[PDB]
Design an enzyme around this catalytic site. Structure first.
Site, PDB file in Angstrom:
ATOM      1  N   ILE A 170      -9.238  -0.171   7.870  1.00 12.52           N
ATOM      2  CA  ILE A 170     -10.385   0.723   7.749  1.00 12.52           C
ATOM      3  C   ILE A 170     -11.365   0.186   6.715  1.00 12.52           C
ATOM      4  O   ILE A 170     -11.040  -0.720   5.938  1.00 12.52           O
ATOM      5  CB  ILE A 170      -9.945   2.151   7.380  1.00 12.52           C
ATOM      6  CG1 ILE A 170      -9.212   2.140   6.041  1.00 12.52           C
ATOM      7  CG2 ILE A 170      -9.074   2.739   8.470  1.00 12.52           C
ATOM      8  CD1 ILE A 170      -8.929   3.507   5.487  1.00 12.52           C
TER       9      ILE A 170
ATOM     10  N   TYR B 132     -12.037   8.495   8.633  1.00  9.81           N
ATOM     11  CA  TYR B 132     -11.590   9.528   9.563  1.00  9.81           C
ATOM     12  C   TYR B 132     -12.326  10.858   9.437  1.00  9.81           C
ATOM     13  O   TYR B 132     -11.817  11.866   9.944  1.00  9.81           O
ATOM     14  CB  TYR B 132     -10.087   9.797   9.400  1.00  9.81           C
ATOM     15  CG  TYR B 132      -9.180   8.656   9.795  1.00  9.81           C
ATOM     16  CD1 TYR B 132      -8.899   8.394  11.131  1.00  9.81           C
ATOM     17  CD2 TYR B 132      -8.586   7.854   8.829  1.00  9.81           C
ATOM     18  CE1 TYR B 132      -8.064   7.352  11.492  1.00  9.81           C
ATOM     19  CE2 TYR B 132      -7.750   6.813   9.178  1.00  9.81           C
ATOM     20  CZ  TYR B 132      -7.492   6.566  10.510  1.00  9.81           C
ATOM     21  OH  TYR B 132      -6.657   5.529  10.858  1.00  9.81           O
TER      22      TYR B 132
ATOM     23  N   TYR C 202       0.825  -1.196   0.000  1.00 11.09           N
ATOM     24  CA  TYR C 202       0.000   0.000   0.000  1.00 11.09           C
ATOM     25  C   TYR C 202       0.866   1.254   0.000  1.00 11.09           C
ATOM     26  O   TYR C 202       2.048   1.232   0.354  1.00 11.09           O
ATOM     27  CB  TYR C 202      -0.952   0.012   1.200  1.00 11.09           C
ATOM     28  CG  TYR C 202      -0.283   0.123   2.552  1.00 11.09           C
ATOM     29  CD1 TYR C 202       0.183  -1.008   3.209  1.00 11.09           C
ATOM     30  CD2 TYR C 202      -0.160   1.355   3.193  1.00 11.09           C
ATOM     31  CE1 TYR C 202       0.784  -0.914   4.449  1.00 11.09           C
ATOM     32  CE2 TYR C 202       0.442   1.458   4.431  1.00 11.09           C
ATOM     33  CZ  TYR C 202       0.910   0.319   5.056  1.00 11.09           C
ATOM     34  OH  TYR C 202       1.504   0.416   6.292  1.00 11.09           O
TER      35      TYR C 202
ATOM     36  N   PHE D  39       1.269  10.214   3.479  1.00 13.55           N
ATOM     37  CA  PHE D  39       1.261  10.023   4.924  1.00 13.55           C
ATOM     38  C   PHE D  39       1.698   8.637   5.365  1.00 13.55           C
ATOM     39  O   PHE D  39       2.145   8.496   6.507  1.00 13.55           O
ATOM     40  CB  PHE D  39      -0.133  10.323   5.500  1.00 13.55           C
ATOM     41  CG  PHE D  39      -1.222   9.429   4.976  1.00 13.55           C
ATOM     42  CD1 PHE D  39      -1.885   9.740   3.796  1.00 13.55           C
ATOM     43  CD2 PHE D  39      -1.617   8.302   5.684  1.00 13.55           C
ATOM     44  CE1 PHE D  39      -2.888   8.927   3.314  1.00 13.55           C
ATOM     45  CE2 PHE D  39      -2.620   7.486   5.207  1.00 13.55           C
ATOM     46  CZ  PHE D  39      -3.259   7.801   4.021  1.00 13.55           C
ATOM     47  N   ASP D  40       1.601   7.614   4.518  1.00 15.84           N
ATOM     48  CA  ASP D  40       2.012   6.270   4.896  1.00 15.84           C
ATOM     49  C   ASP D  40       2.327   5.487   3.631  1.00 15.84           C
ATOM     50  O   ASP D  40       1.680   5.666   2.596  1.00 15.84           O
ATOM     51  CB  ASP D  40       0.925   5.557   5.712  1.00 15.84           C
ATOM     52  CG  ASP D  40       1.442   4.319   6.429  1.00 15.84           C
ATOM     53  OD1 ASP D  40       2.649   4.013   6.323  1.00 15.84           O
ATOM     54  OD2 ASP D  40       0.635   3.647   7.105  1.00 15.84           O
TER      55      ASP D  40
ATOM     56  N   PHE E 111      -5.189   5.783  -2.090  1.00 18.63           N
ATOM     57  CA  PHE E 111      -4.223   4.728  -1.814  1.00 18.63           C
ATOM     58  C   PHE E 111      -3.763   4.073  -3.104  1.00 18.63           C
ATOM     59  O   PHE E 111      -4.587   3.717  -3.953  1.00 18.63           O
ATOM     60  CB  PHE E 111      -4.814   3.670  -0.887  1.00 18.63           C
ATOM     61  CG  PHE E 111      -5.082   4.167   0.491  1.00 18.63           C
ATOM     62  CD1 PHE E 111      -4.066   4.221   1.429  1.00 18.63           C
ATOM     63  CD2 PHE E 111      -6.349   4.597   0.848  1.00 18.63           C
ATOM     64  CE1 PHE E 111      -4.310   4.687   2.706  1.00 18.63           C
ATOM     65  CE2 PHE E 111      -6.601   5.060   2.120  1.00 18.63           C
ATOM     66  CZ  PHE E 111      -5.581   5.109   3.052  1.00 18.63           C
TER      67      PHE E 111
END
Length: 107
Positions: free
Chosen positions: A56, A82, A26, A36-37, A99
């Site tokens: 999620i 979120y 991912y 962010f990730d 993503f």
């Protein structure tokens, strides 16, 4: 809502089932924002199972619609991950998530 935008190659028949631990490279992306990730930095490609609400809701439903080898692109709505709460310091509330997801799994 989960919006799938697939970069083509894969097989289109090896689908995840219940209780199957699957492997995803991912890569998170903020809409009109930076990353962010990502699992490419850690190179620990996140062996997670299906059907235990660990990930999620925007990421769980997209993994069921993919197959082995496929490289999709998620569009996660705020209300499933979120949008009301927001993660402290990383994800503000009312956030639409993107993503880069490739499913090269096991089991």
């Amino acid at each position: 809502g989960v919006e799938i935008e697939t970069i083509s190659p894969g097989d289109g028949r090896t689908f995840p089932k219940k209780g199957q631990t699957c492997v995803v490279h991912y890569t998170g992306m903020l809409q009109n924002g930076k990353k962010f990730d990502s699992s490419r930095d850690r190179n620990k490609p996140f062996k997670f199972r299906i059907g235990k609400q660990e990930v999620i809701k925007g990421f769980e439903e997209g993994a069921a619609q993919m197959s082995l080898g496929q490289r999709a692109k998620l569009t996660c709505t705020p209300d499933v991950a979120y949008g009301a709460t927001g993660h402290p310091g990383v994800i503000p509330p009312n956030a639409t998530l993107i993503f880069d997801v490739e499913l090269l799994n096991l089991e």
